[PDB]
């Protein structure tokens, strides 16, 4: 009856803490020390956690969740009824676990080399090339090289991966893996809600796109930019053209109003990766939110190791299910882009700390988008010229020209990301549901790159190419839609918190630093964890239960008016009517 259900939940929680804590550190040691020994221990602990998941997941399935009164106990048991990979027969499970490891390792050790010269890693080398080089062929070298070495090498593993992850999904009651991933949001209208939100950001994105295309035309020449076509994917300062902020020097709306070199400022003033996290820690505590434990500073990998060992460099935050042990793993470079990233990862850590008293099953964000959005919200305030100047990193100010410059800087990071973050799982959901087969992987990737982002490949794609594999989340099997949700909702959070802090006038000038009223709304929402449906947490922060693009539109409203006037006087076509155009 009801007593057996709550007894089971107690027992699940006690044993999960112990086994999840042990899997986490085995996983940590591989991620921070990629060897054969650490690989083998991880694969052994994989079967141990599966053994636990199988045991309690089988017991969970004997209960009737909707025939149980307490909804909190109902919520936990339903979740435990999902075995994930542990639903696969023993042979399939080890094959799947090996495939995952082999995709992750291949991506992380991939290098692009000159014939008789240096071998370059993605971070920081190729990253730096995409950010700083302004030569078409040198950008092309890194862009094509990374796809030849990382993307092409992932292709051999992917079809089998898709089969095994879909098999696990079906055995847990889903139709495919995409269906399983979407279920995390507990929102029947998810796909429609997301498309509506994407459509609302069209006026802003098409105008940014057109403006940037014009500036690329000016710099890279008329023979390489079609003013009515898609932009070549290697020219936006980022390996995946997901954020366009590194090409700010090519697009600055008012060159007469220049801003400080932030990296030069950081490096000169002796900014260390450690200081960047200390400053993020300060922002959280200023809001009355929890500080990171002394253990965090002892066990975290806050920069790339010098011992010449292989690591997973991608930035991640870690919960060890201790209630005491939380870590960040990041190959941090001393610049503004990574300062934003440091806050984002610290946002994860705060979330871990805020819901640490809940049963481990409920230890997750309201939805995965919420988990991503926390650090980004605070970072929106750090990014203001007024806050950056107070860190001695800028000098921008009370001026209309500097104001439009800042909004362009923010838009190249925030608006540009919208179509990309949307695109990734659109391709992926259709791969899981069978709409896209291995014969059309890459072609359907680029149809969507064209359709949503208005980008084209600088070099025509050949057989054997698998460019999705050259993006971290693909071989690592981490979903991507949260980042889309995060970017919409983080402005909703920013708007509400700014109001709660008593700030008036344009939204983009708001800095919530030290606001205890804003901290309170965040804390109460974060404490809920995964115990309640997400619209409850949305309500707690914003005073309303919906996802909405209004906050983002309002934030960038001054920029949209400026972009419309600017694109109008140059006679720009919005979009890419000549959609079949590729470089000669
Ligand atoms: C359904 O079962 C759940 C879980 O057993 C019940 O939720 C629990 O309710 C108690 C209060 O009735 C919560 O305790 C409170 O929180 C802290 C303790 O850490 C304390 O500072 C407060 O003063 C208060 O005692 C407890 O946290 C909460 N547990 C969870 C996991 O949410 C719930 O009451 C049951 N529902 C019904 C309708 O009976
Ligand atoms: Cl690509
Ligand atoms: Zn994140």
Numbering used by the authors: 40 to 434, 436 to 624
Paste lines from the article.
Somatic angiotensin-converting enzyme (sACE), a key regulator of blood pressure and electrolyte fluid homeostasis, cleaves the vasoactive angiotensin-I, bradykinin, and a number of other physiologically relevant peptides. sACE consists of two homologous and catalytically active N- and C-domains, which display marked differences in substrate specificities and chloride activation. There is also a smaller testicular form of ACE (tACE), which is transcribed from the same gene and identical to the C-domain of ACE. The active site for both domains is contained within the large central groove, with the signature HEXXH zinc-binding motif residing on the α15 helix. ACE activity is dependent on chloride ions, with the degree of dependence being substrate-specific.
The chloride ion is directly coordinated by Arg522 in the native C-domain, along with Tyr224 and a water-mediated interaction to Trp220. Mutation R522Q also resulted in the loss of the chloride ion, with Gln522 making strong hydrogen bonds with the backbone of residues Pro519, Tyr520, and Ile521 and a weak cation-π interaction with Tyr523. Furthermore, a sulfate ion was present in the active site, making direct coordination with the zinc ion and surrounding residues of the S1 subsite, including Tyr523. The replacement of Arg522 with a lysine or a glutamine causes a decrease in chloride affinity, in agreement with the structural data. At 0 mm NaCl, R522Q shows a marked increase in activity over both C-domain and R522K with Z-FHL and AngI, suggesting that additional interactions for the 522 position beyond chloride coordination are important. The most noticeable effect of the R522Q mutation is the greater kcat values that increase with substrate length and are even higher than C-domain for AngI.
